[PDB]
Paper text:
Each subunit consists of a predominantly β-stranded extracellular domain and an α-helical transmembrane pore, which interact via an extended interface. Whereas ELIC forms a cation-selective channel with high conductance that is activated with high efficacy by the primary amines cysteamine, propylamine, and GABA, the cation-selective GLIC is activated by protons and inhibited by bulky positively charged compounds that also act as open channel blockers of the nAChR.
The introduced conformational freedom upon replacement of the restrained amino acid proline with the flexible glycine has resulted in the rearrangement of the M2-M3 loop and the unfolding of the C-terminal part of M2. The remainder of the helix has collapsed towards the pore axis as to maximize the hydrophobic interactions of residues at the extracellular part leading to a structure, which, most probably, prevents the permeation of ions. In contrast to the large conformational change in the extracellular part of the helix, its conformation at the intracellular half remained unchanged. Remarkably, this pore conformation is very similar to structures of GLIC obtained from cysteine crosslinking of residues at the domain interface, which were previously assigned to a locally closed conformation of the ion conduction path, the structures of two nonactivating mutants in the M2-M3 loop and a recent structure of GLIC at neutral pH. In this locally closed conformation, an interaction of a histidine residue in the pore-forming helix M2 with the backbone of the neighboring helix M3 established in the low pH crystal structure of GLIC is broken. When studied by two-electrode voltage clamp electrophysiology, the GLIC mutant P246G shows dose-dependent channel activation with an EC50 that is shifted by 0.5 pH units towards higher proton concentrations. Another distinct nonconducting conformation of the pore region was observed in a high pH crystal form of GLIC and in several mutants of the same channel, including the structure of the mutant P246G determined in this study. Thus, to our surprise, the mutation of a conserved proline in the M2-M3 loop to glycine still promotes activation in both channels, ELIC and GLIC.
Numbering used by the authors:
A (entry chain D), B (entry chain C), C (entry chain B), E (entry chain E): 7 to 312, 317 to 320
D (entry chain A): 7 to 316
């Protein structure tokens, strides 16, 4: 029983985040526990304050017509508890629910350690007969409770795109809104826990540029190659595999390259030396002592600028 | 209270995908959040437009008789919220629900990295007394919302097989439909993340074809064999094990072969050399430098053509 | 309000498997989505065909008395949707629900790679006052939908034990039925993925029977021992650990024995050689070249016959 | 509407285990599917046998007052289906439900492989006005269905402590009962799968007491140290980590000790030999050949007696 | 129908923890099963003791107005069962439910092995018209059942902050309470299971300060580096990765430092020795024998004081 009106019915929305949590880097989802405030004029149940009742009259969701506000990018239904309903004498209804849902918003790990994400919460309403348009009341949208957090992240801003996107879906318009939670990853431990140890093992590997014994250098390079893979297993992360090409996966691919040419060099040095030609061997090794750290530094500056400064 | 008719009742179907997600390569399932549009003529509740009411009359699922549409290949029930019911003056009902279910469709990984899948959604309806036959309305079947995604995949087409499969199950005919979601894996990272590093370690392994020391070559081949397994553990995937013989599992089996015959070669070279016969040893090793990369390239071309070009 | 009869009430059962899935080798459970058809004579609601109504009359589960059919070996309750209820003029009721439950049936992995399982579905009914006995209608029991599958398995037969087991539980008899889903594992990949590579590494291990250097043989045997464990980690399976002694675990234990006696041999060969006695050393090594593959083949034939041929 | 009596109301209890499963060694929980039988005299609904009705009268839980029996150590609520209610002519009620719950009972792994556990199920009842005291009827408590199992365990006895513990909680007495499920771990595979292979690798480790090359012994002891950790990773168990000190963790700590002093010895032997003192070196090594197996056997007998024989 | 009063309505709260469990170090959540006692004066249903009824009158939550008490930091809703409602002759209501919820409270692992946590449970109540303020009754807050436990922890004190935080949220005040569960980790096994073996491998690593062979020292240091990583994988913990810098992660980073400079030393020792300069080589090695354990002990004392004694 919708409210008969003279023109499109505006339903004012608003989300107050109480809790944010369970940011799943794998499934690109996150869980939210928030408020949902809705308001619309339904003069059909406007009441007399002086004639009877009081300043404001409260109803049960059974009694009144409520706009069906579904979320778009939610896995299941939006687990909801109705907190309050308050009708104004002119017919202005004030709806407030406390919901919890896991939202499905895509994540872009192309800069994995130093990346920022913008989660989405989408609200729509299908139009039964009178056309329905959702808009946002800023005062009810101040969604961030101060003590709301994602442990690995910093929370920038929870805001909303005021302009709705009025679709046309199966011979009926729909009004879509766009709530946006802006986060940015906080990455202290990655320098001590991930990168620096992975560079320690790699340096150890090309300590064989000051050595001559093929046996020691293979027990050097190859044994450290196992340590690299073993350490990668130790620091295996939920998004270590990604369909697109990440940044962290480029330098991690380059690390796998610098073990190959390290094996290539000690093999070349060994062949040159064993083929009565040590002048060339101990010259390639001398060069490697500088060539490897520079080509590394270079290609990492090339790679850093490739993803970040571009 | 079914609709008494003169002949079989057609129920027009249609599914509008709102969300696709959680494609489980292990359990061969995937989650879907979509619309379900149904329409059928029930002149038993045809209404008078002019005499009373308006253009269209809305009912509650309790009031009217609704056709029971079950999904076949769904794990549990199909979590549904009824969005709208709209009866037409002639008695044409317009049903619309928004459901979410995890569907069970078999996946064929015989070409794992470069594979295409056709997910299925099966609709059936049992016949209470009047025979029931489902068919599809293309206009309500345009299932793909533009911003729907599976992160590892590209989405080709959401279509439906217009011809139903009319069964006979326990003295009652049933009508089954076939909705098809066609996907194809997107595999950028696999060359840098999986294949190339796994080929690097194998090349390192047969660097012992330019070496003579049995100690170094066993510390060579065998140490890299550990690196192969360790890297396979690092890049362990949900479907690495499969009951049938995959492609990726064939070349991965061949990799395990080329470590054996590499150990076979360095062992033969060592025996020939130690049995006062170095002419033959350093001749088999000379051959290995070419024999191994070619038989590999060949058998991989043989293997690629075996699965793909056939 | 149960049906007053003259003697025990028979309730005819039947299960039509629509889906089988999620065979959990660990928890010895599996998920099923099937039909459940029940029928009993309740002349208390026999109706007059000509005098009124039609051929068959439909009721709501509220209206009628329904026998409480519980499952025995189900984790929780049996998620049920009532599909149809159809009473016959003589009072014969036709109940049909579509349920989904995860069943708990023990699994016997004593032949793990090549094993067959018989899953159970147990139905019981307690007797309120009139004694209740369940039996099976074969026509409603044809449970296998043709396109039902467990990916790792072949599905032999879904049948039912016609004879019920009538218990006596807390001063009231109960009638138990036994539905049996017979499966047998399909094991293509195990030869290429599990057994053959695990035999490759073991062959590599005792290549030290054609070598003399203790350093190479320890970097041989011991380095390959790590590869065995690492590969076992790579191919770790849900049921690798079991309280009873499996088959695959016997040969996997034997593999661990042949590394010990391999270390024993190379240590003994080294001691004999270093104690100015090379005649005996290079004689024990000569023998090992034949003793190890034969005792293996033998003890594996002994092991195969022990589990399978007995 | 509680039953007015003359003195405290006794409620007779009883639990019939139908299924036991999902014994979670980590979370110290386990799942149970059982019967719950309750009986109490409520002469307020004693009925006339001859004047009307029959031998026994059945009610709906709505109609009658039922004692609220909660479980203490259950995670959530206790998923219940009401099977039967049977009132006796004198007013004796016979309640029977079939519940399923996961119970929370602490586990003591101080003897992990060879340990016995006593799981608990706690029943309490708060007193509304008349004081309530629960006790057990032995005939309805025979909880073990014969074919009930925990795969890794043997089930000794399901019994109950007849004496309740009558508390006083928030100005109201409560009556607590103690049901006890006694299990003892069945540990066949642990000798072949865990201990024996872990002892093999340790034996291999101190095969370096019959060797002189420091290179072979470091490629011996240290390479086997990796194998120990890798095998521990292969046989990683749910309760491998525990806050208290387990038995299995003591001998596993001692294994880590015997690798250190093995490295200690070969280093000392190498130093003594290289410091022109081979008489002392080859004398410490001679001693190690006996000292290590004896101190091991000893300290394990010391450790076995410390946990078990004490 | 709220209770009309003369001034703000006080609602007295109280939580009796029955069970604590599932402390999730990863998601910083924990599960609780407790009582919730509420009391407020609603003279609107004050009753006449002598005129009718008895001492206390029981209602159904339907009949009475109950304050909506929500939890703030809970994932979903708070699974609740109403145990008792008791109205006093003056109009004082006694509400009592038994709930179970998983709470979301941040955890600080900056002292991981030796850390104490203070979990929070937050109660609020929105004000319908009359202002609502919650406060705590100490007698009903005695939350700790004696036999309540977290296996890895000791439970210090369950108390509550008597002063509420009265907010102003969307043009309506709310009253927030703060319940505090104080725990402290109990860390016996960490010395035998985590630290001591990880120090054993590190000691083994720098046993190469009493050796001269570059081959043995690289098969020494590097082989133990794999063992360090492998052992870290064996002892992988839920919170091993954290966005902030933990204590345990600092000393674990230092361990990674002492493997690098250990390789640096043996490489420098080898270069000095091979560059006809053994006086300097065997002098740097002599110094390392003391410098490494002291700088370790030092930097660990510096590190311990840095986190704990500051």
């Amino acid at each position: 029983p919708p409210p008969i009106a003279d023109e499109p019915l505006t339903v004012n929305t608003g989300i107050y985040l109480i809790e944010c949590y369970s940011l799943d880097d794998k499934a690109e989802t996150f869980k939210v526990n928030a408020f949902l405030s809705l308001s619309w004029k339904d003069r059909r149940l406007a009441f007399d304050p002086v004639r009877s009742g009081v300043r404001v009259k409260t109803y049960e969701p059974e009694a009144i017509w409520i706009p069906e506000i579904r979320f778009v990018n939610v896995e299941n239904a939006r687990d909801a508890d109705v907190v309050d309903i308050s009708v104004s004498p002119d017919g202005t209804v004030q709806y407030l629910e406390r919901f919890s849902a896991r939202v499905l918003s895509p994540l872009d790990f192309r800069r994995y350690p130093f990346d920022s994400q913008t989660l989405h919460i989408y609200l729509i309403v299908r139009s039964v007969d009178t056309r329905n348009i959702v808009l946002a009341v800023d005062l009810e949208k101040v969604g961030k409770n101060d003590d709301v957090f994602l442990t690995g992240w910093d929370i920038e801003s929870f805001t909303a795109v005021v302009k709705p996107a009025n679709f046309a879906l199966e011979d009926r318009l729909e009004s879509k809104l766009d709530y946006q939670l802006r986060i940015s990853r906080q990455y202290f431990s990655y320098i001590p826990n991930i990168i620096l140890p992975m560079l320690f093992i790699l340096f150890i590997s090309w300590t064989a540029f000051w050595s001559t014994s093929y046996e020691a250098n293979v027990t050097l390079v190859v044994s450290t190659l196992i340590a690299h893979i073993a350490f990668n297993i130790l620091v295996e992360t939920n998004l270590g595999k990604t369909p697109y090409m990440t940044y962290t996966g480029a330098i991690i691919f380059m690390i796998y390259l610098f073990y190959f040419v390290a094996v290539i060099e000690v093999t070349v040095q060994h062949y040159l030396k064993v083929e009565s030609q040590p002048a060339r061997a101990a010259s390639i090794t001398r060069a490697s002592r500088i060539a490897f750290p520079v080509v590394f530094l270079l290609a990492n500056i090339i790679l850093a600028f490739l993803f970040f400064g571009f």
